[PDB]
Design a protein around this ligand. Structure first.
Ligand SMILES: *[C@@H]1O[C@H](CO)[C@@H](O[C@@H]2O[C@H](CO)[C@@H](O)[C@H](O)[C@H]2NC(C)=O)[C@H](O)[C@H]1NC(C)=O
Ligand SMILES: CCCCCCCCCCCCCCCCS(=O)(=O)O
Ligand SMILES: *[C@@H]1O[C@H](CO)[C@@H](O)[C@H](O)[C@H]1NC(C)=O
Ligand SMILES: [Ca+2]
Ligand SMILES: [Ca+2]
Length: 534
């Protein structure tokens, strides 16, 4: 019943879900299989005329979060689950996975010109799919608000399939394939969304964790030039936990190590051209080899095996420098964090129990940091258990004497203080920032990483006022304050500014605060950002 005629003349059919109309699994690129592996996506040439798009397609190949070259129980367990026929059935994945989904309010028609919210999922650049992020909650609230929006989500290649690095990848011009996938989908939106009822000039991009850092990368892409056919691809951005990626160049030390490890695992250790060898192995073999390189939950933790890296061509340099140098798109942005971003990742190093062990874990993780920098970091983030994350929990949550400490560091460097650095240097447009403490009191994890996804797509809570309401108002009017919340959200200018600059959330609701916590950590970390790159 729901119908749309694309830019090339094809007329497709969608599904009518009563509370919304959806067009799921629309292919936007040729399958990145065979020799197309690790390469830039090719725009989809083909006819969709007369086809129905009523279910999400498979996700791209997934990496075992507990993967590693070592052997252990968590690895063995997840693998057991991931290779199970019930899992293969409920959550299918494939290399042919580049599809896009368009969900809109019931009755939307071409020409409606509704603002568009483009969702980029986050799964540590190693797992993820669009099907696990139900848009219904957002769509319904927007209708109730009298501010209807269209929800679009794009699949992108993750892990080795989409973020392989090293000398060979660089020489070929194939760096950051997963990000290029997202870019192509954006171009697809520009060219086709009007047929669905969306306004291509009113696109807001947003994501959480890896999806949020993806949004940052898009603001920095092509030195800030975000146009396609003479027009900007998006007019605003919403970053839920995640800003710049602290990573070395694509042909740096770790990018090359991972490439070589993967090549050995796949049986390409002897190839004169390892890259062509990798395009030749079966997907089973490639999946196998990849699961034998560290996943984000393994001991390596946030020193990721696969993630966006400056290539000198589309991301021209160190991302912190691009932000200092003004090489970004000039757009209004909302960027925020969960109080305790690092607790879930801190669970990966629970065998680290003494200060000497913590120092070695940090040294091993930050190869560019000197001893003095490591010492400064360990002074800024002391052993004192009352000082770590879950923040403000006193002597509680002492899984080990270092857990709270390691959680404070990972959460700050990867997300929370990284955000402050961006905000203190970005002048491209109005800035709004939030900090959630909605789950204060939750044992072990606190207001943990990704809990926002629950209150944005699954359950209603005080946080939904921001994750749905405020975000809908921003995508519609470029000002979250049009949502009619009782607490006015103040513009953020600087972390040293006078007055409250953060929208805050607790179990009861909203209130405002200041972005002046852990200044000692900010300086330990960001005095010379590249000392802590991976
Ligand atoms: C905590 O566990 C990790 C994970 O096994 C240990 O690191 C590994 O140690 C083995 C055995 O020596 C090495 O072959 C691996 O290369 C290490 N893995 C990584 C990812 O580095 C680590 O030594 C343990 N830490 C403590 C403090 O005991
Ligand atoms: C101590 C080991 C860690 C050291 C490095 C920490 C800083 C580097 C962070 C690199 C980006 C990580 C992105 C994770 C997305 C998680 S979501 O959920 O998608
Ligand atoms: C990457 O950069 C090159 C060099 O400017 C440019 O021609 C190319 O169009 C860019 N790719 C994308 C996806 O923007
Ligand atoms: Ca090499
Ligand atoms: Ca500029």
């Amino acid at each position: 019943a729901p119908t749309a005629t694309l830019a090339n003349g094809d007329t497709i059919t969608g599904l009518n879900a009563i509370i919304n109309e959806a067009f799921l699994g629309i292919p936007f690129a040729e399958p990145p299989v065979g020799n197309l592996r690790f390469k830039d996506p090719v725009p989809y040439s083909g006819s969709l005329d007369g086809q129905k798009f009523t279910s999400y397609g498979p996700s791209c190949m997934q990496q075992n979060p507990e993967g590693t070259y070592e052997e252990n129980l968590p690895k063995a367990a997840l693998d057991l689950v991931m290779q199970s026929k019930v899992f293969e059935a409920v959550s299918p994945s494939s290399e042919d996975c580049l599809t896009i989904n368009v969900v809109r309010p019931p009755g939307t028609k071409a020409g409606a010109n509704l603002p568009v919210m483009l969702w980029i999922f986050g799964g540590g650049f190693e797992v993820g799919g669009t099907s696990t992020f139900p848009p219904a909650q957002m769509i319904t609230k927007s209708i109730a608000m009298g501010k209807p929006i269209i929800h679009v989500s794009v699949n992108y290649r993750v892990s080795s399939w989409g973020f392989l690095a090293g000398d060979e990848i660089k020489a070929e011009g194939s760096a950051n394939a997963g990000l290029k996938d997202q870019r192509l989908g954006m171009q697809w939106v520009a060219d086709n969304i009007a047929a669905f009822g969306g306004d291509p000039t009113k696109v807001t991009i947003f994501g959480e964790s890896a999806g949020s850092m993806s949004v940052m990368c898009h603001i920095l892409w092509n030195d800030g030039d975000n146009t396609y056919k003479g027009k900007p691809l998006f007019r605003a951005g919403i970053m839920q936990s995640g800003a710049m990626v602290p990573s070395d160049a694509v042909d740096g030390i770790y990018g090359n190590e991972i490439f070589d490890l993967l090549a050995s695992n796949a049986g390409c250790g002897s190839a004169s051209d390892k890259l062509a060898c990798l395009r030749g192995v079966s997907s089973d073999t490639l999946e196998d080899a990849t699961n034998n390189t560290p996943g984000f939950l393994a001991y390596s933790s946030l020193r990721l095996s696969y993630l966006p890296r400056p290539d000198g061509v589309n991301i021209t340099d160190d991302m912190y420098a691009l932000v200092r140098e003004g090489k970004y798109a000039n757009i209004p942005v909302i960027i925020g964090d969960q109080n305790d971003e690092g607790t879930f990742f801190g669970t990966s190093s629970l065998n680290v129990t003494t200060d000497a062990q913590a120092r070695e874990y940090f040294k091993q993780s930050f190869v560019h940091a000197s001893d003095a920098e490591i010492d400064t970091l360990m002074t800024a983030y002391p052993g004192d258990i009352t000082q770590g994350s879950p923040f403000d929990t006193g002597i509680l949550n002492a899984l080990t004497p270092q857990f709270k400490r390691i959680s404070a560091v990972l959460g700050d460097l990867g997300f929370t203080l990284a955000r402050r650095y961006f905000l203190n240097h970005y002048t491209g447009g109005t800035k709004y920032s939030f900090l959630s403490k909605q789950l204060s009191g939750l044992p072990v994890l606190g207001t943990f990483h990704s809990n926002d996804i629950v209150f944005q797509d699954y359950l209603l809570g005080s946080g939904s006022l921001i994750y749905n309401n405020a975000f809908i108002a921003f995508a519609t009017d470029l000002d979250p304050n049009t949502a009619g919340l009782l607490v006015k959200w103040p513009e953020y200018t600087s972390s040293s500014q006078s007055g409250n600059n953060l929208m805050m959330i607790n179990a009861l609701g909203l209130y405002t605060g200041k972005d002046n916590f852990r200044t000692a950590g900010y300086d330990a970390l960001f005095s010379n950002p590249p000392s802590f790159f991976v």
